[PDB]
């Protein structure tokens, strides 16, 4: 069951630029477990990275 984040470099989901994070967010859109990944990352309060097609910051979504 291919997940988009099994494609390319894992560090794409922890990119050092806004443009890099936008690419990772776009990869997640077609993920078959996207909403489950988002829910679980919120529960764990992931400190950074793209999870469920959203950017995390100290367990919060960067929405703007």
């Amino acid at each position: 069951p291919v997940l988009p984040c099994h494609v390319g470099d894992p560090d794409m989901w922890f990119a050092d630029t806004p443009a890099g994070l936008e690419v990772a967010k776009t990869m997640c859109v077609s993920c078959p477990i996207r909403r489950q990944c988002l829910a679980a990352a919120l529960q764990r309060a992931e400190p950074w990275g793209v999870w469920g097609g959203e950017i995390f910051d100290q367990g919060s979504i960067v929405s703007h």
Binding site: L3, F14, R44, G49
Partner: protein, 92 residues
């Protein structure tokens, strides 16, 4: 089975930077069996305890991420089993 876990864990850690994998190995005692404090790791690398704290937090997040963690799904006491339980919590 346990040797295959050790091999797979090594392969996942080898996808991190030397510094990233080094902080995780020293924190969990993966090489020498002795977990090290953020303080001890700062002294070894000549980096602030605060930067080591940030690296540990950010790297554990990378290791939970399915991009790195998926392969480990198939798989207490040992450093390897403790790292597994820090990545997967209850799923161990």
């Amino acid at each position: 089975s346990f040797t295959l876990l050790q091999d797979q864990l090594q392969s996942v850690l080898d996808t991190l930077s030397e510094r990233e994998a080094g902080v995780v190995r020293l924190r969990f005692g993966l090489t020498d069996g002795q977990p090290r404090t953020l303080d001890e790791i700062g002294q070894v690398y000549g980096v602030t305890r605060e930067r080591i704290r940030q690296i540990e937090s950010k790297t554990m997040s990378k290791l939970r991420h399915p991009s790195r963690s998926q392969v480990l799904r198939d798989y207490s006491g040992t450093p390897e089993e403790r790292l597994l339980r820090a990545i997967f919590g209850e799923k161990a």
